[PDB]
Amino acid sequence: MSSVLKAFERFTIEQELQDRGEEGSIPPETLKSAVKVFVINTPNPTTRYQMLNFCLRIICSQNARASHRVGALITLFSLPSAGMQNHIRLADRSPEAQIERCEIDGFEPGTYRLIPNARANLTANEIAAYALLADDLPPTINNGTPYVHADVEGQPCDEIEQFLDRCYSVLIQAWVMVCKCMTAYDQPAGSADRRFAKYQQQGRLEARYMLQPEAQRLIQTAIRKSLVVRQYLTFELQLARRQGLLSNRYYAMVGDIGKYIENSGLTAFFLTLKYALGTKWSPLSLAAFTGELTKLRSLMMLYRGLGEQARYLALLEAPQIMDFAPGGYPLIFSYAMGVGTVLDVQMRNYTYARPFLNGYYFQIGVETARRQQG
RNA sequence: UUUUUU
């Protein structure tokens, strides 16, 4: 019946785009932790550099609460901006965020103890607790410092041009660790080494300021655990995507790495589109499954409806990422994995093994791909 | 649920 087939297409599309949600919707308020973010009002290379090392040591300190790491990360990401407070208002948007700004004037010489501003709220108990935190590095860390080179932390910065080199190298490493914090973690990574080689070749990253892999893994762990930090990083990525050809040294880097962070955790969706709708010889095979084709059409509609934030569904860890899971289109997923194993050597390394992977349509895709080739 | 490469 033509009416039932037309009705079913409409029903399928409606059921999938009914999950778009509200762009400005605010969830019901739930308890949240208080986060203390440290702000430098003026551009002091000495103070800024010190705060960079302080926050790197807080992020890696074993005796540090989740709130302490979250504040240290927000401060570390905000070190480049000329106005720290106005850049921290971006972090405040997070619905799970309750950030308190603390203005720091300096550090006591020869110590990690903070010197709070008159307006800034810092007790003598907190200052001592933070100083003890900044000196609690893990055993896996060598030379008593996060960096690979011992002399780097001790180096004195008296110019803005120096702090910028140090800061941008550290933040390049932090962003590369973001690249696979929610998807790949607690395992050896080849891509991370490749990104570092690329950015050292570009001259963006300096090997004199590399961190130890243990510190990089600790930074990745701290970023993955907090939703405030990951939402703030999506805000920074969207700021980097709005730029034109003319841009700053920092947001050019952030856009370059956002190219690699984009569409993480949606590999099955984009590989299915690529190898099932990309090849002109797939319509003849999958023409029969109209229901799954309508599903993929409604998913391409849902992706556009989500907006720019759709590229960072995995970083944001939003529920709409369950719509793009291949268990809702298993036959076409199977066919596309078959086609892609022939056409892409790199795809073989990817784990396409699923409980629901149809072996018949996998082999249909393999034989179709090879047939066209030979 | 994710898991490749760019």
mmCIF file of C-alpha atoms (C1' of nucleotides) in Angstrom:
data_model
loop_
_atom_site.group_PDB
_atom_site.id
_atom_site.type_symbol
_atom_site.label_atom_id
_atom_site.label_comp_id
_atom_site.label_asym_id
_atom_site.label_seq_id
_atom_site.Cartn_x
_atom_site.Cartn_y
_atom_site.Cartn_z
ATOM 1 C CA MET A 1 0.000 0.000 0.000
ATOM 2 C CA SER A 2 1.446 3.419 -1.047
ATOM 3 C CA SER A 3 -0.149 5.200 1.981
ATOM 4 C CA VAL A 4 1.502 2.835 4.559
ATOM 5 C CA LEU A 5 4.968 3.167 2.880
ATOM 6 C CA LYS A 6 4.661 7.009 2.743
ATOM 7 C CA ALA A 7 3.331 7.069 6.358
ATOM 8 C CA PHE A 8 6.251 4.904 7.545
ATOM 9 C CA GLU A 9 8.824 7.228 5.991
ATOM 10 C CA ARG A 10 7.130 10.171 7.727
ATOM 11 C CA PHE A 11 6.925 8.261 11.026
ATOM 12 C CA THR A 12 10.605 7.319 10.899
ATOM 13 C CA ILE A 13 11.753 10.869 10.206
ATOM 14 C CA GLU A 14 9.533 12.325 12.932
ATOM 15 C CA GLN A 15 10.652 9.841 15.580
ATOM 16 C CA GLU A 16 14.285 10.771 14.937
ATOM 17 C CA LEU A 17 14.005 14.542 14.699
ATOM 18 C CA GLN A 18 11.736 14.599 17.788
ATOM 19 C CA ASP A 19 15.042 14.165 19.751
ATOM 20 C CA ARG A 20 16.546 17.554 18.656
ATOM 21 C CA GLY A 21 15.709 19.199 22.041
ATOM 22 C CA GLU A 22 15.939 22.960 22.839
ATOM 23 C CA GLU A 23 19.122 24.917 21.865
ATOM 24 C CA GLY A 24 18.770 27.348 24.831
ATOM 25 C CA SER A 25 17.069 24.888 27.255
ATOM 26 C CA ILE A 26 18.448 24.966 30.876
ATOM 27 C CA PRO A 27 18.223 21.597 32.762
ATOM 28 C CA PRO A 28 16.684 21.361 36.266
ATOM 29 C CA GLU A 29 19.244 22.781 38.762
ATOM 30 C CA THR A 30 21.230 20.044 40.618
ATOM 31 C CA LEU A 31 23.953 20.322 43.265
ATOM 32 C CA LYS A 32 27.322 21.402 41.894
ATOM 33 C CA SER A 33 30.806 21.775 43.303
ATOM 34 C CA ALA A 34 32.361 25.158 43.961
ATOM 35 C CA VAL A 35 35.346 25.800 41.684
ATOM 36 C CA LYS A 36 38.002 28.433 42.406
ATOM 37 C CA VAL A 37 39.658 29.885 39.293
ATOM 38 C CA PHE A 38 42.719 32.103 39.684
ATOM 39 C CA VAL A 39 42.866 35.320 37.608
ATOM 40 C CA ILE A 40 45.841 37.620 36.732
ATOM 41 C CA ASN A 41 44.394 41.129 36.005
ATOM 42 C CA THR A 42 47.606 42.427 34.307
ATOM 43 C CA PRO A 43 49.944 40.610 31.831
ATOM 44 C CA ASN A 44 52.867 39.631 34.130
ATOM 45 C CA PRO A 45 55.183 37.121 32.337
ATOM 46 C CA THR A 46 56.781 36.251 35.735
ATOM 47 C CA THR A 47 53.397 35.733 37.514
ATOM 48 C CA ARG A 48 51.677 34.151 34.445
ATOM 49 C CA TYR A 49 54.564 31.656 33.932
ATOM 50 C CA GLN A 50 54.502 30.829 37.692
ATOM 51 C CA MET A 51 50.725 30.228 37.500
ATOM 52 C CA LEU A 52 51.239 27.973 34.482
ATOM 53 C CA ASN A 53 53.600 25.786 36.492
ATOM 54 C CA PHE A 54 51.369 26.013 39.587
ATOM 55 C CA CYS A 55 48.299 24.802 37.686
ATOM 56 C CA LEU A 56 50.270 22.053 35.942
ATOM 57 C CA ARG A 57 51.351 20.854 39.391
ATOM 58 C CA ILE A 58 47.820 21.033 40.801
ATOM 59 C CA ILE A 59 46.477 19.007 37.865
ATOM 60 C CA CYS A 60 49.095 16.297 38.482
ATOM 61 C CA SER A 61 49.096 16.296 42.302
ATOM 62 C CA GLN A 62 47.878 12.976 43.784
ATOM 63 C CA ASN A 63 46.293 14.663 46.874
ATOM 64 C CA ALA A 64 44.014 16.995 44.813
ATOM 65 C CA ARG A 65 40.164 17.060 44.791
ATOM 66 C CA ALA A 66 38.222 17.093 41.460
ATOM 67 C CA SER A 67 37.213 20.761 42.119
ATOM 68 C CA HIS A 68 40.928 21.723 42.506
ATOM 69 C CA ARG A 69 41.833 20.109 39.117
ATOM 70 C CA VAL A 70 38.830 21.756 37.398
ATOM 71 C CA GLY A 71 39.877 25.203 38.584
ATOM 72 C CA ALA A 72 43.502 24.564 37.627
ATOM 73 C CA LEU A 73 42.444 23.514 34.120
ATOM 74 C CA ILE A 74 40.179 26.535 33.659
ATOM 75 C CA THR A 75 43.041 28.781 34.768
ATOM 76 C CA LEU A 76 45.546 26.998 32.528
ATOM 77 C CA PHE A 77 43.341 27.333 29.412
ATOM 78 C CA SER A 78 42.656 31.059 30.219
ATOM 79 C CA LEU A 79 46.380 32.042 30.641
ATOM 80 C CA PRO A 80 46.734 33.302 26.976
ATOM 81 C CA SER A 81 43.732 35.754 27.023
ATOM 82 C CA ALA A 82 44.542 39.465 27.694
ATOM 83 C CA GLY A 83 41.520 39.737 30.052
ATOM 84 C CA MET A 84 41.200 36.569 32.204
ATOM 85 C CA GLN A 85 37.908 37.499 34.003
ATOM 86 C CA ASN A 86 35.994 38.288 30.752
ATOM 87 C CA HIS A 87 37.278 34.958 29.302
ATOM 88 C CA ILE A 88 36.178 33.060 32.481
ATOM 89 C CA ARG A 89 32.563 34.278 31.897
ATOM 90 C CA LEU A 90 32.594 31.867 28.894
ATOM 91 C CA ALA A 91 33.390 28.975 31.354
ATOM 92 C CA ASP A 92 30.451 30.198 33.588
ATOM 93 C CA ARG A 93 27.877 29.288 30.839
ATOM 94 C CA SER A 94 28.293 25.557 31.727
ATOM 95 C CA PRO A 95 25.056 24.467 33.559
ATOM 96 C CA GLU A 96 27.126 22.226 35.945
ATOM 97 C CA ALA A 97 29.567 25.135 36.616
ATOM 98 C CA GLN A 98 29.680 27.335 39.790
ATOM 99 C CA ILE A 99 33.065 29.103 39.222
ATOM 100 C CA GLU A 100 34.437 31.662 41.753
ATOM 101 C CA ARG A 101 37.142 34.041 40.467
ATOM 102 C CA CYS A 102 40.149 34.727 42.706
ATOM 103 C CA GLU A 103 42.571 37.506 41.774
ATOM 104 C CA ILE A 104 46.240 36.681 42.384
ATOM 105 C CA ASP A 105 48.935 39.362 42.460
ATOM 106 C CA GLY A 106 51.982 37.119 42.708
ATOM 107 C CA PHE A 107 53.658 34.192 44.382
ATOM 108 C CA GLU A 108 55.889 34.486 47.418
ATOM 109 C CA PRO A 109 59.497 34.268 46.083
ATOM 110 C CA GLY A 110 61.036 30.742 46.255
ATOM 111 C CA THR A 111 57.617 29.173 47.101
ATOM 112 C CA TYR A 112 54.296 28.142 45.429
ATOM 113 C CA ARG A 113 52.321 30.135 48.073
ATOM 114 C CA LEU A 114 49.798 32.560 46.508
ATOM 115 C CA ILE A 115 49.603 36.283 47.239
ATOM 116 C CA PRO A 116 45.847 37.092 47.062
ATOM 117 C CA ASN A 117 44.535 40.553 45.963
ATOM 118 C CA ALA A 118 42.647 42.696 48.544
ATOM 119 C CA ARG A 119 39.368 42.048 46.607
ATOM 120 C CA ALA A 120 40.356 38.341 46.171
ATOM 121 C CA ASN A 121 39.107 35.916 48.895
ATOM 122 C CA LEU A 122 41.968 33.638 50.123
ATOM 123 C CA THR A 123 42.464 32.484 53.766
ATOM 124 C CA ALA A 124 45.830 31.389 55.286
ATOM 125 C CA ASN A 125 44.539 27.762 55.525
ATOM 126 C CA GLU A 126 43.693 27.653 51.764
ATOM 127 C CA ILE A 127 47.044 29.266 50.703
ATOM 128 C CA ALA A 128 48.914 26.585 52.703
ATOM 129 C CA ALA A 129 46.745 23.784 51.311
ATOM 130 C CA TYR A 130 47.387 25.003 47.767
ATOM 131 C CA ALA A 131 51.130 25.225 48.421
ATOM 132 C CA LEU A 132 51.118 21.642 49.697
ATOM 133 C CA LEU A 133 49.126 20.570 46.632
ATOM 134 C CA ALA A 134 51.579 22.197 44.238
ATOM 135 C CA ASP A 135 54.396 20.007 45.695
ATOM 136 C CA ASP A 136 52.619 16.562 45.667
ATOM 137 C CA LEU A 137 53.817 15.149 42.278
ATOM 138 C CA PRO A 138 53.336 11.359 41.692
ATOM 139 C CA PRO A 139 56.232 8.794 41.860
ATOM 140 C CA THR A 140 55.877 8.079 38.076
ATOM 141 C CA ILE A 141 57.005 11.729 37.484
ATOM 142 C CA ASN A 142 60.824 12.086 37.063
ATOM 143 C CA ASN A 143 63.074 15.059 38.115
ATOM 144 C CA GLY A 144 60.432 16.339 40.590
ATOM 145 C CA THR A 145 58.859 18.353 37.711
ATOM 146 C CA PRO A 146 56.310 17.600 34.906
ATOM 147 C CA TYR A 147 58.588 18.659 32.023
ATOM 148 C CA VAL A 148 60.987 16.341 30.238
ATOM 149 C CA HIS A 149 63.839 18.794 30.889
ATOM 150 C CA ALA A 150 64.691 19.654 34.539
ATOM 151 C CA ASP A 151 66.035 23.213 33.788
ATOM 152 C CA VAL A 152 62.794 24.405 32.032
ATOM 153 C CA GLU A 153 60.699 25.087 35.220
ATOM 154 C CA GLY A 154 63.559 27.037 36.942
ATOM 155 C CA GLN A 155 64.016 29.317 33.873
ATOM 156 C CA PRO A 156 62.956 32.953 34.637
ATOM 157 C CA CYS A 157 60.488 34.720 32.265
ATOM 158 C CA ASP A 158 60.657 38.573 32.224
ATOM 159 C CA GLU A 159 59.127 39.194 28.742
ATOM 160 C CA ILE A 160 55.690 38.549 27.210
ATOM 161 C CA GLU A 161 57.246 36.917 24.151
ATOM 162 C CA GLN A 162 58.814 34.170 26.283
ATOM 163 C CA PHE A 163 55.734 33.285 28.318
ATOM 164 C CA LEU A 164 53.834 32.962 25.050
ATOM 165 C CA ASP A 165 56.225 30.309 23.719
ATOM 166 C CA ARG A 166 56.069 28.315 26.959
ATOM 167 C CA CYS A 167 52.292 28.715 27.333
ATOM 168 C CA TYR A 168 51.477 27.803 23.743
ATOM 169 C CA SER A 169 53.659 24.679 23.840
ATOM 170 C CA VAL A 170 52.015 23.473 27.055
ATOM 171 C CA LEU A 171 48.546 24.222 25.683
ATOM 172 C CA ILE A 172 49.315 22.520 22.361
ATOM 173 C CA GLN A 173 50.036 19.394 24.370
ATOM 174 C CA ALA A 174 46.867 19.807 26.453
ATOM 175 C CA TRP A 175 44.706 20.194 23.330
ATOM 176 C CA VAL A 176 46.266 17.157 21.661
ATOM 177 C CA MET A 177 45.395 15.230 24.821
ATOM 178 C CA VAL A 178 41.821 16.489 24.422
ATOM 179 C CA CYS A 179 41.834 15.030 20.885
ATOM 180 C CA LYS A 180 41.185 11.520 22.309
ATOM 181 C CA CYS A 181 40.221 11.961 26.014
ATOM 182 C CA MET A 182 36.592 10.696 25.716
ATOM 183 C CA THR A 183 37.268 8.142 22.898
ATOM 184 C CA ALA A 184 40.757 6.603 23.487
ATOM 185 C CA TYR A 185 42.462 6.655 26.939
ATOM 186 C CA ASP A 186 44.770 4.545 29.214
ATOM 187 C CA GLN A 187 46.481 2.992 26.109
ATOM 188 C CA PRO A 188 49.531 3.757 23.864
ATOM 189 C CA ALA A 189 48.638 6.352 21.169
ATOM 190 C CA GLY A 190 50.445 6.724 17.799
ATOM 191 C CA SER A 191 48.355 9.703 16.566
ATOM 192 C CA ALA A 192 49.388 11.849 19.593
ATOM 193 C CA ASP A 193 53.105 11.402 18.650
ATOM 194 C CA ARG A 194 52.218 12.295 15.027
ATOM 195 C CA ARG A 195 50.410 15.470 16.114
ATOM 196 C CA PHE A 196 53.392 16.517 18.219
ATOM 197 C CA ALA A 197 55.753 15.928 15.293
ATOM 198 C CA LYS A 198 53.470 18.013 13.069
ATOM 199 C CA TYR A 199 53.333 20.944 15.488
ATOM 200 C CA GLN A 200 57.069 20.831 16.176
ATOM 201 C CA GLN A 201 57.665 20.877 12.418
ATOM 202 C CA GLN A 202 55.220 23.809 12.048
ATOM 203 C CA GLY A 203 57.263 25.432 14.881
ATOM 204 C CA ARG A 204 54.095 25.900 17.009
ATOM 205 C CA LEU A 205 55.429 23.467 19.653
ATOM 206 C CA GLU A 206 58.964 23.562 21.063
ATOM 207 C CA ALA A 207 60.585 20.326 22.224
ATOM 208 C CA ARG A 208 62.362 22.209 25.014
ATOM 209 C CA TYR A 209 58.953 22.602 26.680
ATOM 210 C CA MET A 210 57.573 19.083 26.259
ATOM 211 C CA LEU A 211 55.854 17.412 29.187
ATOM 212 C CA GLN A 212 56.450 13.882 30.387
ATOM 213 C CA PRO A 213 53.971 11.286 29.055
ATOM 214 C CA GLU A 214 52.855 10.672 32.650
ATOM 215 C CA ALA A 215 51.908 14.334 33.014
ATOM 216 C CA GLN A 216 50.194 14.300 29.617
ATOM 217 C CA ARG A 217 48.183 11.251 30.681
ATOM 218 C CA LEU A 218 47.266 12.970 33.955
ATOM 219 C CA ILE A 219 46.126 16.082 32.061
ATOM 220 C CA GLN A 220 44.018 13.908 29.748
ATOM 221 C CA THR A 221 42.483 12.164 32.768
ATOM 222 C CA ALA A 222 41.651 15.472 34.449
ATOM 223 C CA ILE A 223 40.049 16.847 31.236
ATOM 224 C CA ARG A 224 37.931 13.660 30.657
ATOM 225 C CA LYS A 225 36.489 13.566 34.246
ATOM 226 C CA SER A 226 35.118 17.184 34.264
ATOM 227 C CA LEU A 227 32.107 18.282 32.151
ATOM 228 C CA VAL A 228 32.713 21.940 33.005
ATOM 229 C CA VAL A 229 36.161 21.794 31.400
ATOM 230 C CA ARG A 230 34.919 19.923 28.334
ATOM 231 C CA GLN A 231 32.024 22.326 27.778
ATOM 232 C CA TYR A 232 34.437 25.247 28.164
ATOM 233 C CA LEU A 233 36.730 23.628 25.590
ATOM 234 C CA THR A 234 33.824 23.282 23.161
ATOM 235 C CA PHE A 235 33.200 27.015 23.642
ATOM 236 C CA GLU A 236 36.841 27.751 22.797
ATOM 237 C CA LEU A 237 36.663 25.444 19.758
ATOM 238 C CA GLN A 238 33.597 27.281 18.485
ATOM 239 C CA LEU A 239 35.360 30.605 18.986
ATOM 240 C CA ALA A 240 38.233 29.228 16.907
ATOM 241 C CA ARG A 241 35.843 28.096 14.165
ATOM 242 C CA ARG A 242 34.292 31.548 13.723
ATOM 243 C CA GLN A 243 37.542 33.140 12.568
ATOM 244 C CA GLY A 244 38.478 34.296 9.054
ATOM 245 C CA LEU A 245 41.848 33.805 7.271
ATOM 246 C CA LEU A 246 43.375 36.559 9.517
ATOM 247 C CA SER A 247 43.719 35.256 13.139
ATOM 248 C CA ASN A 248 45.835 35.141 16.385
ATOM 249 C CA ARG A 249 48.680 32.676 17.087
ATOM 250 C CA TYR A 250 46.553 30.863 19.686
ATOM 251 C CA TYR A 251 43.203 30.489 17.926
ATOM 252 C CA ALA A 252 44.913 29.416 14.711
ATOM 253 C CA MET A 253 46.369 26.497 16.690
ATOM 254 C CA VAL A 254 43.028 25.778 18.339
ATOM 255 C CA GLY A 255 41.306 25.653 14.950
ATOM 256 C CA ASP A 256 44.024 23.391 13.563
ATOM 257 C CA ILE A 257 43.541 20.906 16.412
ATOM 258 C CA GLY A 258 39.766 21.258 16.346
ATOM 259 C CA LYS A 259 40.009 19.767 12.880
ATOM 260 C CA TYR A 260 41.139 16.533 14.578
ATOM 261 C CA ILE A 261 38.778 16.808 17.538
ATOM 262 C CA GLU A 262 35.700 17.151 15.247
ATOM 263 C CA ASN A 263 33.235 14.199 14.821
ATOM 264 C CA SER A 264 34.895 12.060 17.565
ATOM 265 C CA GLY A 265 32.838 8.971 18.603
ATOM 266 C CA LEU A 266 30.722 9.158 15.382
ATOM 267 C CA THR A 267 33.218 7.058 13.323
ATOM 268 C CA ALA A 268 30.561 4.444 12.491
ATOM 269 C CA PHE A 269 28.113 7.095 11.265
ATOM 270 C CA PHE A 270 30.513 8.939 8.988
ATOM 271 C CA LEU A 271 32.148 5.735 7.746
ATOM 272 C CA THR A 272 28.698 4.339 6.946
ATOM 273 C CA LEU A 273 27.764 7.472 5.000
ATOM 274 C CA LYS A 274 31.170 7.401 3.288
ATOM 275 C CA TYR A 275 31.184 3.777 2.136
ATOM 276 C CA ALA A 276 27.441 3.203 1.634
ATOM 277 C CA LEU A 277 26.376 6.506 0.062
ATOM 278 C CA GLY A 278 29.838 7.603 -1.137
ATOM 279 C CA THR A 279 30.152 4.669 -3.620
ATOM 280 C CA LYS A 280 27.705 4.702 -6.618
ATOM 281 C CA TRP A 281 27.698 0.840 -6.693
ATOM 282 C CA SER A 282 26.008 0.553 -3.242
ATOM 283 C CA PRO A 283 22.434 1.690 -4.213
ATOM 284 C CA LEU A 284 21.880 -1.570 -6.211
ATOM 285 C CA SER A 285 22.740 -3.679 -3.097
ATOM 286 C CA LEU A 286 21.057 -1.588 -0.317
ATOM 287 C CA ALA A 287 18.155 -0.305 -2.508
ATOM 288 C CA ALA A 288 15.939 -2.928 -0.739
ATOM 289 C CA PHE A 289 16.435 -1.558 2.833
ATOM 290 C CA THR A 290 14.338 1.656 2.494
ATOM 291 C CA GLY A 291 13.824 1.730 6.313
ATOM 292 C CA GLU A 292 17.555 2.015 7.096
ATOM 293 C CA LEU A 293 18.103 4.534 4.299
ATOM 294 C CA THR A 294 15.315 6.659 5.770
ATOM 295 C CA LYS A 295 17.010 6.260 9.156
ATOM 296 C CA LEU A 296 20.294 7.603 7.774
ATOM 297 C CA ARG A 297 18.438 10.455 6.062
ATOM 298 C CA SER A 298 16.740 11.404 9.336
ATOM 299 C CA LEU A 299 20.130 11.206 11.072
ATOM 300 C CA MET A 300 21.692 13.586 8.545
ATOM 301 C CA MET A 301 18.750 15.885 9.270
ATOM 302 C CA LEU A 302 19.265 15.550 13.023
ATOM 303 C CA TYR A 303 22.956 16.402 12.673
ATOM 304 C CA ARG A 304 22.150 19.660 10.881
ATOM 305 C CA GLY A 305 19.414 20.443 13.394
ATOM 306 C CA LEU A 306 21.915 20.119 16.280
ATOM 307 C CA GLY A 307 23.951 23.083 14.930
ATOM 308 C CA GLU A 308 27.737 23.694 15.196
ATOM 309 C CA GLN A 309 27.864 21.958 18.648
ATOM 310 C CA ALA A 310 26.975 18.663 16.770
ATOM 311 C CA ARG A 311 30.713 18.214 15.842
ATOM 312 C CA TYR A 312 31.521 17.945 19.584
ATOM 313 C CA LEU A 313 28.830 15.506 20.751
ATOM 314 C CA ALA A 314 31.397 13.161 22.302
ATOM 315 C CA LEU A 315 33.342 15.951 24.053
ATOM 316 C CA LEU A 316 30.001 17.392 25.355
ATOM 317 C CA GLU A 317 28.894 13.748 26.092
ATOM 318 C CA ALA A 318 25.292 14.669 25.040
ATOM 319 C CA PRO A 319 22.592 11.887 24.862
ATOM 320 C CA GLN A 320 21.823 12.585 21.195
ATOM 321 C CA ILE A 321 25.003 10.648 20.384
ATOM 322 C CA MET A 322 23.037 7.434 20.970
ATOM 323 C CA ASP A 323 20.985 8.172 17.851
ATOM 324 C CA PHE A 324 24.080 7.823 15.661
ATOM 325 C CA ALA A 325 25.059 4.443 17.107
ATOM 326 C CA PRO A 326 25.191 1.755 14.390
ATOM 327 C CA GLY A 327 22.864 -0.587 16.276
ATOM 328 C CA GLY A 328 20.018 1.378 14.723
ATOM 329 C CA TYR A 329 21.148 0.673 11.145
ATOM 330 C CA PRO A 330 23.055 -2.617 11.393
ATOM 331 C CA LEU A 331 22.707 -3.987 7.840
ATOM 332 C CA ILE A 332 24.009 -0.864 6.114
ATOM 333 C CA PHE A 333 26.708 -0.502 8.760
ATOM 334 C CA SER A 334 27.786 -4.078 7.974
ATOM 335 C CA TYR A 335 27.829 -3.470 4.230
ATOM 336 C CA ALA A 336 29.812 -0.253 4.682
ATOM 337 C CA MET A 337 32.404 -1.859 6.947
ATOM 338 C CA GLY A 338 32.816 -4.548 4.310
ATOM 339 C CA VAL A 339 33.287 -1.958 1.566
ATOM 340 C CA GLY A 340 35.662 0.092 3.702
ATOM 341 C CA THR A 341 37.946 -2.795 4.593
ATOM 342 C CA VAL A 342 38.700 -3.159 0.877
ATOM 343 C CA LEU A 343 38.907 0.528 -0.018
ATOM 344 C CA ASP A 344 40.687 1.816 3.117
ATOM 345 C CA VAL A 345 43.778 0.064 4.655
ATOM 346 C CA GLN A 346 43.485 2.323 7.779
ATOM 347 C CA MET A 347 39.840 1.148 8.395
ATOM 348 C CA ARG A 348 41.064 -2.459 9.141
ATOM 349 C CA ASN A 349 42.740 -1.172 12.392
ATOM 350 C CA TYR A 350 39.351 0.307 13.537
ATOM 351 C CA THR A 351 37.171 -1.940 15.764
ATOM 352 C CA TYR A 352 34.046 -2.468 13.686
ATOM 353 C CA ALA A 353 33.234 -5.737 15.459
ATOM 354 C CA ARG A 354 29.737 -5.511 16.921
ATOM 355 C CA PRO A 355 27.264 -8.006 18.378
ATOM 356 C CA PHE A 356 24.864 -6.926 15.624
ATOM 357 C CA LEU A 357 27.207 -6.994 12.625
ATOM 358 C CA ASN A 358 25.602 -9.035 9.838
ATOM 359 C CA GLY A 359 28.197 -11.307 8.246
ATOM 360 C CA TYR A 360 26.252 -11.743 5.020
ATOM 361 C CA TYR A 361 26.078 -8.036 4.198
ATOM 362 C CA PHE A 362 29.647 -7.587 5.383
ATOM 363 C CA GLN A 363 30.719 -10.161 2.781
ATOM 364 C CA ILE A 364 28.386 -8.572 0.227
ATOM 365 C CA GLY A 365 30.216 -5.280 0.697
ATOM 366 C CA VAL A 366 33.633 -6.944 0.545
ATOM 367 C CA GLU A 367 32.826 -8.819 -2.668
ATOM 368 C CA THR A 368 31.171 -5.756 -4.234
ATOM 369 C CA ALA A 369 34.228 -3.568 -3.487
ATOM 370 C CA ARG A 370 36.756 -6.195 -4.763
ATOM 371 C CA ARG A 371 34.579 -6.903 -7.872
ATOM 372 C CA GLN A 372 34.708 -3.178 -8.870
ATOM 373 C CA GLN A 373 38.498 -3.140 -8.174
ATOM 374 C CA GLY A 374 39.454 -6.302 -10.076
ATOM 375 C "C1'" U B 1 28.830 3.218 24.239
ATOM 376 C "C1'" U B 2 33.660 4.123 22.115
ATOM 377 C "C1'" U B 3 37.819 2.122 19.467
ATOM 378 C "C1'" U B 4 41.118 4.062 12.040
ATOM 379 C "C1'" U B 5 43.440 7.964 9.581
ATOM 380 C "C1'" U B 6 43.565 13.049 8.526
#
